[PDB]
Amino acid sequence: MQNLKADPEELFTKLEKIGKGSFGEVFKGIDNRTQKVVAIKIIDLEEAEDEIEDIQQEITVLSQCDSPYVTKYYGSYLKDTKLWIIMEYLGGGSALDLLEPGPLDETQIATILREILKGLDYLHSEKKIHRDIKAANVLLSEHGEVKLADFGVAGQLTDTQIKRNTFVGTPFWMAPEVIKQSAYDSKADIWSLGITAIELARGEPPHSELHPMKVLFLIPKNNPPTLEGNYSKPLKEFVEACLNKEPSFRPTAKELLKHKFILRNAKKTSYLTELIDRYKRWKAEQS
């Protein structure tokens, strides 16, 4: 909090609400010095209560990241009972949004996975673990650039704490060692990435129609999910590689960036604008 700032409205204009809202609400905004659009997450501190140390964690993590693959951080500003967390505006919405009109093709899947993997590689090299990897936290610019967002439950490894054990994340995407609250590390993100790959290919993660508390016992109990259906062998093998019950048998993000599925199928991020346009057309017609 030592770089906390004040009087945000002298540097930024707050515009309309655009969504939720991990810990608050997100507003569109303007940087009055550049006229670039920004996203402003606003947190009511007097009702914050329980989530206060998660809010603190998010700011800390964001302030420590400097990557094209992680939502850029402008700063946090105190205004009365409100905290403004000002971040990169990403006008293409989330990968989850972009799934709504229908299936992706494997070029789009590989392209999105590649950029997620670059983000994971960065975070894991900084001894950070995202711990909530899913399509909803993968955000895109209007021209298709891809970044990881929402660091409210991110973990930080240090020389004296080489593993985490906190029960956090979203049950469908959680690694088994996380559910068991075993000592875990960045390999937990690699499991979540595997589930996210299935989500991008099928539209939804495994068990998506069950109550989340059910999957809390299903995920450790069952064999790992596999990608079923008519998908290329490398995509299926990519998923299988990620979804190993034994975390040390999962590849690193660096290694997955050299996986045949990624190399054969990933193309320019700018082609993802086709997906953004598909969503805009679809949303405009939606009754």
Ligand SMILES: CCN(CC)CCNC(=O)c1c(C)[nH]c(/C=C2\C(=O)Nc3ccc(F)cc32)c1C
């Ligand atoms: C047409 C509207 N759709 C539903 C009705 C899409 C709704 N969603 C939208 O409009 C939307 C857009 C275009 N950006 C954001 C949020 C963020 C953004 O830009 N950078 C961030 C960095 C961090 C973070 F935590 C959130 C954001 C939303 C909710």
Ligand SMILES: [Cl-]
């Ligand atoms: Cl944008």
Ligand SMILES: [Cl-]
């Ligand atoms: Cl098993």
